[PDB]
């Protein structure tokens, strides 16, 4: 079974580079990215009239190459997914193909294929081009980016709401005050909506320059209100950046602790000991050959099941973080044990000599 085993190792290597990349395997996915992003750029350059022809001729070849590459990749992935015990046989392959991103990949591939086939309403054939960024969306596994962003945003809700609220009030007030000063002299500030547009464009520091104050009172007001409100309009980015960095540091800290350890190792042992109750040579003796008192071995198995369940729980718990008050707890345990030891000395001295 050397050839079958080498084939299984090759299957596992392909599955690992395709589904769970680490280290060097990334050089594959990066390539795929450079194949998709480039394509997208060309489609944008196809919207310009002066550059439409060249963009179309380049896009044809690029998309044919992309079709071939992604069809081959889908086939190789569906084949290599068989290495896991969950997906084996044609039923296991069908079960693997039932995942949402896999059927999305199939949909996108067959849609692009049928589109180019019908090419042989081309406006719709060009509008179907935007479906390609889904091949970068699939890179985000279970939406980790959205979950990280949502967690950090929810942890800092009060600060963000405060910043946005104060900034909105400052914007309204500054727009009104500049409008009052610029209305008759400057035609840029015809209405209050014009002043609000100027104020928002100024306060985010975009500064288009289509609307500017011309009077000196308006300029002094704008300078003061900009000094006041630009800091409020830039606060959320700083808050979120500091939050992200603090979260990274706090996660890098816990890595050094390595607290979970021992529980995972003990769980495998309790599981093996339970399993071996029903197949070990330790039970294949005349003594154990069950006919007269079956319950004895059943009772021994029941005890191993209870210990297995204790080990599974202790193992699941290890994942949970632990406080820095453990040192106080060890002193409490250590002091109590020692104080009880001096008592046991005291009682024995009082027993013998009295």
């Amino acid at each position: 079974s050397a050839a079958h085993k080498r084939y299984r190792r090759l299957q596992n290597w392909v599955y690992n580079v395709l589904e769970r990349p680490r280290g060097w395997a990334f050089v594959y996915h990066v390539f795929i990215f450079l194949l998709v992003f480039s394509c997208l750029v060309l489609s944008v350059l196809s919207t310009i009239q002066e550059h439409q022809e060249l963009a179309n001729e380049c896009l044809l070849i690029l998309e044919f190459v992309m079709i071939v590459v992604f069809g081959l990749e889908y086939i190789v992935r569906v084949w290599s997914a068989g290495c896991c015990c969950r997906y084996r046989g044609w039923q296991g392959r069908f079960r693997f193909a039932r995942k949402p991103f896999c059927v999305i990949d199939f949909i996108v591939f067959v849609a692009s294929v049928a589109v180019i086939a019908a090419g042989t309403a081309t406006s719709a054939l060009r509008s179907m081009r935007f479906l390609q960024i889904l091949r970068m969306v699939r890179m985000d596994r279970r939406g980790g980016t959205w979950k990280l962003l949502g967690s950090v945003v929810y942890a800092h809700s009060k600060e963000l709401i405060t910043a946005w609220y104060i900034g909105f009030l400052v914007l309204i007030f500054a727009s009104f005050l500049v409008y009052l000063a610029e209305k008759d002299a400057n035609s840029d500030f015809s209405s209050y909506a014009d002043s609000l547009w100027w104020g928002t464009i100024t306060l985010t520091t975009i500064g288009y320059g289509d609307k500017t104050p011309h009077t000196w009172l308006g300029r002094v007001l704008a300078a003061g209100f900009a000094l006041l409100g630009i800091s409020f309009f830039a606060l959320p980015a700083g808050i979120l950046g500091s939050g992200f960095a603090l979260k990274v540091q706090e996660q890098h800290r816990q890595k050094h602790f390595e607290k979970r350890r021992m529980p995972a190792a003990n769980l495998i042992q309790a599981a093996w000991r339970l399993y071996s109750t029903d197949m070990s040579r330790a039970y294949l003796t005349a003594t154990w050959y069950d006919d007269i008192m079956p319950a004895v071995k059943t009772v021994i198995r029941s005890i191993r099941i209870l210990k297995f369940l204790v080990a599974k729980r202790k193992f699941k718990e290890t994942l949970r973080p632990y406080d820095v008050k453990d040192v106080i707890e060890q002193y409490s345990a250590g002091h109590l044990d020692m104080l009880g030891r001096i008592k046991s000395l005291q009682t024995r001295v009082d027993q013998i000599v009295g």
């Binding site: 015990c85 350890r261 190792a265 042992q269 319950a295 198995r301 005890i303 209870l306 297995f308």
Partner: protein, 146 residues
């Protein structure tokens, strides 16, 4: 693997070895007494942890319905398969679902409630070890969860 009535009666006969008085419950006294008769020496806190894993009533006892559930289930549940597989993955840095025979041997005999040499020899014999010396532990987990 529908639980049959004869299987239930054999569980009942084991349950009655613990609950010799016929009270329908197993406390730390009944559990620990049977265990020490076989030469085991659990602590009181270990007997409480064991009973607590299956005591839904929270009164420190195991009744027959709880006993039967534990015995019928063993490790076949999906929670057991996942957690055991997660324990192996602690020692799989590559993330490829493999662990070396020699690394399995080190962890089994040097951490936790260490396996004896003969225990760990039987464990490595039972895993269909590859010619390199690498063990696919996820199929090892399905054999213990079958």
């Amino acid at each position: 693997d529908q639980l049959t009535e004869e299987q239930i009666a054999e569980f009942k006969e084991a349950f009655s070895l613990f609950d010799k008085d016929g009270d329908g419950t197993i406390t730390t006294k009944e559990l620990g007494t049977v265990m020490r008769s076989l030469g085991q020496n659990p602590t009181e806190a270990e007997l409480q942890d064991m009973i607590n894993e299956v005591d839904a009533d929270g009164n420190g006892t195991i009744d027959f319905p709880e006993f039967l559930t534990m015995m019928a289930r063993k490790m076949k549940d999906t929670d057991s398969e996942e957690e055991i597989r997660e324990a192996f993955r602690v020692f799989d840095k590559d993330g490829n679902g493999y662990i070396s025979a020699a690394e399995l041997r080190h962890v089994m005999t040097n951490l936790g409630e260490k396996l004896t040499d003969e225990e760990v020899d039987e464990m490595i014999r039972e895993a269909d070890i590859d010619g390199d010396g690498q063990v696919n532990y996820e199929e090892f987990v399905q054999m213990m969860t079958a």
